Design an enzyme around this catalytic site. Sequence first.
Site, PDB file in Angstrom:
ATOM      1  N   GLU A  43       0.731  -1.214  -0.078  1.00 28.94           N
ATOM      2  CA  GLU A  43      -0.049   0.132  -0.159  1.00 28.94           C
ATOM      3  C   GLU A  43       0.728   1.323   0.071  1.00 28.94           C
ATOM      4  O   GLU A  43       0.849   2.128   0.951  1.00 28.94           O
ATOM      5  CB  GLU A  43      -0.986  -0.054   1.191  1.00 28.94           C
ATOM      6  N   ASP A  44       1.681   1.311  -0.995  1.00 29.89           N
ATOM      7  CA  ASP A  44       2.531   2.651  -1.331  1.00 29.89           C
ATOM      8  C   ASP A  44       3.566   2.570  -0.144  1.00 29.89           C
ATOM      9  O   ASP A  44       4.085   3.795  -0.184  1.00 29.89           O
ATOM     10  CB  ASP A  44       1.685   3.927  -1.264  1.00 29.89           C
ATOM     11  N   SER A  45       3.917   1.723   0.523  1.00 26.35           N
ATOM     12  CA  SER A  45       5.085   1.615   1.434  1.00 26.35           C
ATOM     13  C   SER A  45       6.087   1.141   0.836  1.00 26.35           C
ATOM     14  O   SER A  45       6.303   0.616  -0.080  1.00 26.35           O
ATOM     15  CB  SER A  45       4.757   0.799   2.623  1.00 26.35           C
TER      16      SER A  45
END
Lengths: 48, 49, 252, 64, 49, 44, 49, 49
Positions: H8-10
């Site tokens: 998740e966009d990490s």
Amino acid sequence: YARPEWMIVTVLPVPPLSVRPAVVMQGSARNQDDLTHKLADIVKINNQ
Amino acid sequence: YNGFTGRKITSQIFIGPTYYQRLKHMVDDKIHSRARGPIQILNRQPMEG
Amino acid sequence: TCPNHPDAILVEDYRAGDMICPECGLVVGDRVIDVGSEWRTTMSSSDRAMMNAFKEITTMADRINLPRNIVDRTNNLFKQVYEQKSLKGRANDAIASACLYIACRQEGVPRTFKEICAVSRISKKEIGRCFKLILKALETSVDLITTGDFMSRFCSNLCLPKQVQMAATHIARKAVELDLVPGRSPISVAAAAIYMASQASAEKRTQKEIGDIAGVADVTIRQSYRLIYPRAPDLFPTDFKFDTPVDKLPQL
Amino acid sequence: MIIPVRCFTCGKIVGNKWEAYLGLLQAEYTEGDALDALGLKRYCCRRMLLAHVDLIEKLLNYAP
Amino acid sequence: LDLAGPLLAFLFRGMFKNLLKEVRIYAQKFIDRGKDFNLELAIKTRIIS
Amino acid sequence: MIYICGECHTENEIKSRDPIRCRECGYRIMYKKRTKRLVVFDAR
Amino acid sequence: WERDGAPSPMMPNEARLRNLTYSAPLYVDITKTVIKEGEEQLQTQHQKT
Amino acid sequence: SYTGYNQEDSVIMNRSAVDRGFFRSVFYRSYKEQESKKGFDQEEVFEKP
Ligand SMILES: [Zn+2]
Ligand SMILES: [Zn+2]
Ligand SMILES: [Zn+2]
């Protein structure tokens, strides 16, 4: 609880010091709240 | 290869040089906590101190 | 006011804004300190007259480009003088001009009476009269001006090199030290010293040019120059490069 | 501003190769040939000098 | 597009007008007394600055 | 109390009361000297 | 202009460091002509006001 | 998808690369304070209390 005569302002209440506090600014110069200035005006006219 | 076990990863990974940027937003500038802090005098409600 | 510890110096706390018994731990007052603000982390004639004088003071200052701090100092002098009311007869513009002169003297950057007059409609004579009165009214005093208090402004306004300015300052200071010009005004001594230093360097300024910036008539500069000319080699700094040799300095 | 001491990826020493790299480039070496001459085989270490911007040289033009 | 020039010219037009409006007031007062006026003193430099 | 001139880079001792300015340069931008106190860095 | 009133050129970095506005003095030539209703005309100009 | 910590966009970073100065930056905060003598009653100066 309410009367038409009570609407007329015969005696004006004064908010406590909690409602209007004495702010401190520029050292020990107590900056009175806006209510105090109006109250100071109110008493002056009333005395006059 | 897996770093922890050294076993080949079954899928081959897409790896190469890409230009990355560090954005001004660090977590330290954002983390902040409040627990019985300096309430206001007039409103008796929380404020930053 | 610890109930257990009568007359205990409560310690201020910035965590929640409360004062705690220094040796009990008890919090006296829940969150009363107000940490945020506590720590940095239809006009009367008198006021209208003061306001106009304040406007006049700023207008005078910008003409000679004085810093705001002197203007702030000048305003304080005007309020003190205006409040004391020894100059009620004198015009406010004259009082302000004298206050501007005094504020400059107090700050270590004197402006000559002529310089203040040039930026004011009040003549030098009137400013001087107000100047003395204000000192008596305020019971204050101003340090005596020296020849070097005007070298920076005069030399810079003449576009003279820094070495010339240092040489002129040395000449003027030495001349006063040697008492070669007893009784002469410090401005005249400074103007003569600037001329002596100027003629000894590549940048040469005529007597008229030095007089205009300094406000000193060339005759007065001529008089002072004649008094210090005999001791020209002594007055000049030892480590001074003479574009024109001292022996060949103008004689007049 | 200045050449990193180590390659970030692998930790190979790179801080003693910037001046040699510039010298090779002045010798008409192509950037690829110069990196090969210095022993930078992995493309992570070649990235170190190929992309280095030497700002310290221009920082030294301001008087202290 | 209004860049610095046109934007600053708009301001300077008004400020110069105030400057010239001011010299009239100062000069007229001195003329009413009958005494000649000094041009330098009339100009208020803070208006444009 | 050593201040370094920003123009000529001349160390000069200045008190709290006396005005801030270069003794010889006349420059009015001064920089405080590095503290003599020793601060430890981890080379990390 | 310093406290002593000596003008010096202002470098932008000094303006940034000392919080000075980076402005240039503005000078205007002004021509003043006076008529004394005595069929005499006197023209004087104030250079660089 | 190495360990699920980049979901998740990490992003997963290399600690050793960070140890070698990878994306290390400097933060400069500047504070300006001036002392004002305005007002004869009150005055403020720089000095250790
Ligand atoms: Zn106790
Ligand atoms: Zn590498
Ligand atoms: Zn210096």
